[PDB]
Design a protein around this ligand. Structure first.
Ligand SMILES: CCCCCCCCOCCOCCOCCOCCO
Ligand SMILES: CCCCCCCCOCCOCCOCCOCCO
Ligand SMILES: CCCCCCCCOCCOCCOCCOCCO
Lengths: 301, 301, 301
């Protein structure tokens, strides 16, 4: 069975200097089935991904059961599968100055995307959850000696709160050229009525020149070094009636290289029916940074 | 909600010299919704446009209400939104020698396409209609100082006839390189039973070397000059029973550069059910021009 | 009317040296309609082919009736339309070492693919079938003097068996550069309960350097020569309960150039519901050849 859903948005966006019209529409194909013993299986991808979904680069395929779910394709990484990301600000998701996303190292469309189809395993039992993920250590089916990437996370919900932790590791095929990167994450999610609060603290080590490239700095002509980093952040959103207001603030401090605090503030008004007016503002504290902002309508079909 | 429709055609086509098989199939995704106060909203794009529809280059998004409809994306331009184009000849739309389309300067996939998402506003009240359109004056969200393009049109239906007028203007970012282009259009549409008659007269001014490029002439190594042009044409089609016969003739006279009359004659036979046999013939009076022609079946699903 | 179906698979694949995750998902658009006298017409293409299906390179359009079916697009060639191919081994279709496909010269995505939309005509009456196919002798609608390719096949079912024959011919536009290629095929299909047996014998002549390129050999700096070849093979599959086991073996002997025998063995277990576990092994006898193999699940929606 194949079900269709879709979305669209339109409005105006300020990129720091000019306003521009911004719009889009997408269509999602969700396919499902149950085997005779009650195993579930399915697949989904958006229409603009038809081509990569046909090679396993985009879209995901899965099979679940009493043993947990195995998913393959552009599967999220284990930590991000359990904890997700922060309040999404702006109708276009105002990612320009850093975004609402938690800086997960692996999985998805993140640092490991070249590796795809990656595999995600997840399993819950009552109030606990575990997730583990990895590439094959080759570039999909072309047996390329590469990035072996992997992650593990686990959570525990106790009433109102989930708290969890995860570990992500990216192995370098030539550490004289690229240090291995690793990160440890702790996250705590709390819902109190119409308010959601999500907070995280991650720490680990990054390859020097990847870290210098994050902040847009030329690399240094030397062998690879690992620098230490710690990241952390918070979003709060609440809904009153049909109005949600929310924001987030996060910091990345990569030691010996630079520090940035980035943030955003947004609001939505639900017109009911699948449409809402959404608008937002995000920025960070580095040097250049010019706020971006937007305002428009978002539609779910 | 997401509805699917689609089309397909197949037959043989004569390009001036040889016959070739010609065929295609397309699928259109139409998505709709109503908000709690009865505002309508939607989005649509064809499957082969999944990629550009995801950036706002292809497909359109809209929101309508008592105030009129706002549409954003590859929106038609205001004049073309009210008056449309002439009898479509041939199963492949025999556009080779000039086509059935009225030479609108803006909107759509026309001279302004780079500008997209462009915006179209339309509003009717009883028997009158207004439409206005424009780009943002940037290249979508990449704030590129460019083509500010805009148009306005209005119509009035009085029984059997609509008559209307429109104005289209394209501003040059460096008039020493490209003159501004403008056009004024008047159109009159009349339905008399099973006969439709559409006629227009447009006039204005074009950039010299754009006009020379239309007729496929090298440009002249000089600063930009505007040349004056006037365009006009007519189509008539009628249906008897299951057979429609129709044609059009149009002329473009760009002063000091060249004149062309182009035309076409076609017929359809409806097999009922969404299929019809369609065939046609088009040509113009320039020098080379070898008639193109075709014959095949067209299918709507 | 537009119906959606789709498929997906996931598992691990061994390419001769390494195992890799391999997965995909696809969506097929099938569109149909009946005219007032009961002619059927339709079109279909997969989502990842939206772009070529819009030019007639991918997907097919058709119109059938009492006269037979005419199909245009990426239509299969006449022989392959009647006889199909051998047991498909492996969840990814383990085509690496030669595959389960019978070496048809024309149609489809085979040697004639550049030619597409190609045309297929088929007609059955009781127990007999005929099929004929061809390109236009141009490169679709760009009138390119090329490959005129064509084929004819016919079959006869007598109870338990179909036996048939076909002829395929590819004409060279410069025989000093490329010999014409031709092939004659005989095939016999037999179903005995849950067992299917398919066998073929083809023979003809190939262009020398195409034949040398098949076996991956540099060509020889001389004018084109035709070499003679004969191909033949067999697959057997049977289902016991929910387990199907099957395999095939085929040989290509191109005279004065090289001989290869290629084969594969696979099995499926049906989980019911559209999912099955499939796995397989294929290889050939040339020199390098390292077996490929796979194991995973396949899903139909
Ligand atoms: C710890 C691994 C991080 C991996 C993902 C990168 C996280 C990026 O967000 C942090 C930085 O703030 C935004 C980027 O700063 C660069 C300049 O602004 C962009 C235009 O020049
Ligand atoms: C007034 C602005 C016009 C902007 C759109 C162009 C209108 C084109 O149709 C008129 C010309 O007739 C067809 C083209 O003539 C050129 C040569 O034929 C094509 C193959 O060489
Ligand atoms: C008679 C016309 C044949 C036209 C289609 C080609 C048939 C290919 O299958 C036969 C050969 O066996 C597989 C290929 O052998 C080449 C080397 O292996 C591949 C990796 O190097």
């Amino acid at each position: 069975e194949v079900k269709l859903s879709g979305d669209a948005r339109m409005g105006v966006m300020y990129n720091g200097d000019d306003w521009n019209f911004s719009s889009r529409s997408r269509v999602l194909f969700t396919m499902s089935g149950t085997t005779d013993s009650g195993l579930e299986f399915g697949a989904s991808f958006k229409a603009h991904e038809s081509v990569g979904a046909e090679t396993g680069e985009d879209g995901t395929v899965f099979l679940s059961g009493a043993f947990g779910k195995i998913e393959m394709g552009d599967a999220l990484g284990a930590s991000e599968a359990l904890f997700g990301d922060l309040y999404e600000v702006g109708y276009t998701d105002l990612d320009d100055r850093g975004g609402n996303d938690i800086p997960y190292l692996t999985g998805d469309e993140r640092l490991t995307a070249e590796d795809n189809p990656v595999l995600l395993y997840t399993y819950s039992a009552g109030a606990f959850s575990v997730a583990a993920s990895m590439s094959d250590g080759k570039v999909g089916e072309t047996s390329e000696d590469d990035a072996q990437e992997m992650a593990v996370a686990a959570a525990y919900t106790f009433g109102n709160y989930t708290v969890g932790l995860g570990y992500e590791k990216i192995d370098s095929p030539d550490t004289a050229l690229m240090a291995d990167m690793e990160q440890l994450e702790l996250a705590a999610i709390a819902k109190f009525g119409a308010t959601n609060v999500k907070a995280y603290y991650a720490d680990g080590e990054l390859d020097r020149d990847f870290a210098r490239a994050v902040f847009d700095l030329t690399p240094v002509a030397a062998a690879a070094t690992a620098v230490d980093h710690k990241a952390y952040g918070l979003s709060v959103d609440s809904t009153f009636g049909a109005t949600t207001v929310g924001g987030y603030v996060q910091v990345l401090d990569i030691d010996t290289i630079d520090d940035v605090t980035y943030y955003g503030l947004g609001a939505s008004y639900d017109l009911g029916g699948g449409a809402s007016i959404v608008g937002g503002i995000a920025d960070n504290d580095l040097p250049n940074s010019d706020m971006v902002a937007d305002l428009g309508v978002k539609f779910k079909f």
